[PDB]
Amino acid sequence: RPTFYRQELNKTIWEVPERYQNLSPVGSGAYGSVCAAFDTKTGHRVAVKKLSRPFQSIIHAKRTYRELRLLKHMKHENVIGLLDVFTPARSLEEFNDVYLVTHLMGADLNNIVKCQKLTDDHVQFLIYQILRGLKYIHSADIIHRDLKPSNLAVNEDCELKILDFGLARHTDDEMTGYVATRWYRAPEIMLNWMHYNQTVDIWSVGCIMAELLTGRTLFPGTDHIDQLKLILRLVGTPGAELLKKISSESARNYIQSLAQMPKMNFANVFIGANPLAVDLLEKMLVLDSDKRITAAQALAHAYFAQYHDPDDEPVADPYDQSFESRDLLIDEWKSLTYDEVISFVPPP
Numbered sequence: 001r002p003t004f005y006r007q008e009l010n011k012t013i014w015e016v017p018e019r020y021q022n023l024s025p026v027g028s029g030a031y032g033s034v035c036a037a038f039d040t041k042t043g044h045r046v047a048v049k050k051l052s053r054p055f056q057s058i059i060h061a062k063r064t065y066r067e068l069r070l071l072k073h074m075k076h077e078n079v080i081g082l083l084d085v086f087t088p089a090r091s092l093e094e095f096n097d098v099y100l101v102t103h104l105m106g107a108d109l110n111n112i113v114k115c116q117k118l119t120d121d122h123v124q125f126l127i128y129q130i131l132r133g134l135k136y137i138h139s140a141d142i143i144h145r146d147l148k149p150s151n152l153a154v155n156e157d158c159e160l161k162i163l164d165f166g167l168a169r170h171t172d173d174e175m176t177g178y179v180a181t182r183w184y185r186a187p188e189i190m191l192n193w194m195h196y197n198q199t200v201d202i203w204s205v206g207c208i209m210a211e212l213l214t215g216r217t218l219f220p221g222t223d224h225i226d227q228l229k230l231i232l233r234l235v236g237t238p239g240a241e242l243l244k245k246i247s248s249e250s251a252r253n254y255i256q257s258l259a260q261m262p263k264m265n266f267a268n269v270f271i272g273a274n275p276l277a278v279d280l281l282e283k284m285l286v287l288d289s290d291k292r293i294t295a296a297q298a299l300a301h302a303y304f305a306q307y308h309d310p311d312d313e314p315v316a317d318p319y320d321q322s323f324e325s326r327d328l329l330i331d332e333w334k335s336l337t338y339d340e341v342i343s344f345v346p347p348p
């Protein structure tokens with residue numbers, strides 16, 4: 001066990017191993033508080049997150065376990081990984097606080113799409129890296145659920161990491177009105193007409209790619225229904241084949257109240273874009289989720305010929321999510337979390 005030291009920063013007590021020095025508060029959310037620090041063991045600048053009320057309810061205890069399991073599994077160049085996890089507690093009986101350590105990230109994709117002139121080469125490389133990370137994530141049967149520019153870290157060499165996995169957290173209030181929190185969501189989950197599945201992440205990538213090409217949000221709806229109307233004007237209303245597949249009766253009743261619309265010509269929407277970029281967008285932004293391109297298929301698209309290497313696009317180890325269907329007490333989720341904290345083995 002390392003030696004820990006205590007300090008109060010912004011009315012919050014931080015008790016951390018001596019290896020972490022020069023702690024500086026950087027932000028706070030409902031999830032917890034975050035400090036930047038220097039890690040003397042690895043030489044990395046790191047982000048240290050202290051979880052807020054991690055075991056206050058069954059829902060919150062299960063969410064803490066879910067986050068730690070996901071972060072411990074992810075080992076890929078284009079996905080956030082876990083450098084360390086620790087607790088100052090010396091036994092399960094005094095266990096109360098959880099701290100998570102990752103590489104410190106600077107700019108997100110917002111900080112570049114608004115502020116840079118991107119060449120087509122930049123778009124190729126950025127979307128390539130998102131799809132490389134997504135192939136890995138999806139190969140473990142994980143769904144990200146919240147891909148958007150603020151959840152993509154980028155550095156000065158245009159290298160990208162996927163962050164901030166959806167932990168089943170977002171509220172109804174946070175999705176209401178003219179809000180970027182909803183602009184990247186697939187139409188079939190915006191009003192919960194389908195269960196989440198991996199194809200919803202590919203919709204998000206299409207929305208992001210379009211915005212990198214044009215500098216503008218693709219579907220900036222003022223509310224759920226305005227946004228659906230923007231989507232259907234671009235990709236058309238459902239055809240007979242998709243209508244037959246749609247399982248939600250609420251979806252069918254409302255959708256068939258709208259006048260039918262054909263799919264638009266994407267070459268007249270994304271004026272001046274690389275024809276190969278337009279072709280890939282047509283394959284991602286498909287209304288019928290069953291027919292969207294997959295991440296593995298998209299990596300082999302000719303738009304990425306300059307970067308695609310099928311020997312350097314790895315898949316993930318299997319990921320056991322059977323805990324999601326389990327009903328446990330608060331203290332049982334807490335004990336499972338404690339076991340995962342003390343069993344952590346750092347990367348080389």
Ligand SMILES: Cn1ncc(NC(=O)c2ccccc2)c1C(N)=O
Binds near residue numbers: 187194247287
């Ligand atoms: C079997 N199946 N394949 C696709 C799909 N639905 C859709 O892709 C969809 C898209 C927009 C709005 C609502 C539904 C279904 C289904 N269970 O509804």
Ligand SMILES: [Cl-]
Binds near residue numbers: 002003018019020
């Ligand atoms: Cl230490």
Ligand SMILES: [Cl-]
Binds near residue numbers: 079080081082103161
């Ligand atoms: Cl990382």
Ligand SMILES: [Cl-]
Binds near residue numbers: 088094096097098
């Ligand atoms: Cl503790």
Ligand SMILES: [Cl-]
Binds near residue numbers: 110148149151
């Ligand atoms: Cl965003």
Ligand SMILES: [Cl-]
Binds near residue numbers: 193194195
């Ligand atoms: Cl479904």
Ligand SMILES: [Cl-]
Binds near residue numbers: 258259260
């Ligand atoms: Cl009509």
Ligand SMILES: [Cl-]
Binds near residue numbers: 318319320321
């Ligand atoms: Cl597993």
Ligand SMILES: [Mg+2]
Binds near residue numbers: 150151164
């Ligand atoms: Mg985020």
